[PDB]
Amino acid sequence: NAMKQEQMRLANQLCFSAYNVSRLFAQFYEKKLKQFGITYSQYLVMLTLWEENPQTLNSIGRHLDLSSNTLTPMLKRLEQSGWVKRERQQLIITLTDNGQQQQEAVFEAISSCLPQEFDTTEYDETKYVFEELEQTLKHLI
Amino acid sequence: NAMKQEQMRLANQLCFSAYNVSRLFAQFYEKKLKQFGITYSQYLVMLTLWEENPQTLNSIGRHLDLSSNTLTPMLKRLEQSGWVKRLIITLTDNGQQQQEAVFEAISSCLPQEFDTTEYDETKYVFEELEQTLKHLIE
């Protein structure tokens, strides 16, 4: 009874906190991604591409958990800006040379705003918590 | 220089993960709540009753920050299911043991190896990261 409650109450709190953290991440990067003319969600797409290039449209959606319908207009906008290329094989998405070159400039603008104060281990703890939550959520999905 | 690069890699890892977690959580709720045919608000109704039974229509109101007006149509749903009874509101036996059904469903997003110490760890970690980001925006 009272133990069940506390559990549900906690799950509720983590769901709102996870939403909060993600929103705060979007607000923080937005201010420095403005100058490159991309939005946070497009940055995340780029981010997965610099990890693994090329990818299919479905590989990208799986990595970000986005429907094919939400990705298309973002990719079309990235192609118009010159960051990726789209080709119908199902779509394959590849990095343009320019979108590869941008990675250094973009990272530059972000890592200047980072806190001087940081440490591997506080980061590893937080990564862990997010990784354990993500892992459990997909297991049910 | 190079440690500054590490910070960027770790920061991108978190934000990428946080974005996933937040979207998967909303999918998880939308799914479990439909499992029972209840909205989030109706879920919160059940939850305030499981903590304090019975309540006045007003009481719940306070708890959800909603007028008495708003709530009346929301309990019809619970009464058609046979979870509550009607200026006073009460859990049934079906509505009482439902706590167990709902708990098993909602509980499942919680990582099974976690114990209360680690659940407190989790809350602390979230708070700290929120504060940090808030600072970085100001």
Are A21 and B128 within 8 A, CB to CB?
A: no
A127 touches chain B (CB under 8 A): yes
Query: A44: which 2 tokens?
Result: 């995340």
Handedness of CA B92, B96, B102, B106 (dihedral sign): positive
Read off φ and ψ for residue A85, nearest 5 degrees. Answer: -125, 145
Q: What is the resolution of this structure in A?
A: 2.5
Considering only CA atoms, give the Rg of chain B: 20
Residues 27 to 56 of B: which have CB under 8 A from any A CB?
Answer: 27-29, 47, 50-51
Q: How many helices (H) and strands (E) does chain A have?
A: 6, 3
CB A10 within 8 A of CB B123: yes
Long-range contacts made by residues A66-72, C-beta under 8 angstroms, separation at least 24?
A71/A45
Q: Please, which contacts does B129-138 make with residues 24 or more away whose CB atoms are closer than 8 Å? A: B129/A21, B129/A126, B129/B14, B130/A17, B130/A20, B130/A21, B130/A24, B132/A115, B133/A21, B133/A24, B133/A25, B133/A27, B133/A28, B134/A24, B135/A115, B136/A28, B136/A113, B136/A114, B136/A115, B137/A24, B137/A27, B137/A28, B137/A31
Residue B34's Cβ-count burial label (10 Å; 0-12, 13-18, 19+) is exposed
Q: How far, in Å, CA of B106 to CA of B110, rounded?
A: 8
Distance from CA of A24 to the nearest CA of B (A): 6
This entry's atomic model was obtained through X-ray
Coil, strand, or helix at residue A111? helix
Long-range contacts of B94-99 (CB under 8 A, 24+ apart): B95/B46, B95/B49, B96/B50, B98/B46, B99/A1, B99/A4, B99/A5, B99/B46, B99/B50
A105 touching chain B per CB within 8 A: no
- Distance CA(A92)–CA(B23), nearest Å, equals 24
DSSP code, position A85: E
Q: Which residues pair with A95 in a beta bridge?
A: A84
Domains identified in chain B and CATH numbers:
1-138 (1.10.10.10)
Considering CB atoms only, which of A14, A126, A136 is closest to B14? A126
Question: Could you tell me the two tokens for B138?
Answer: 């100001």
Q: Strand A91-95 to strand B55-56: parallel, antiparallel, or no bridges (unpaired)? A: unpaired
Put simply, the answer to whether A4 touches B99 (Cβ < 8 Å) is: yes
Place of tokens 């918590």: A129
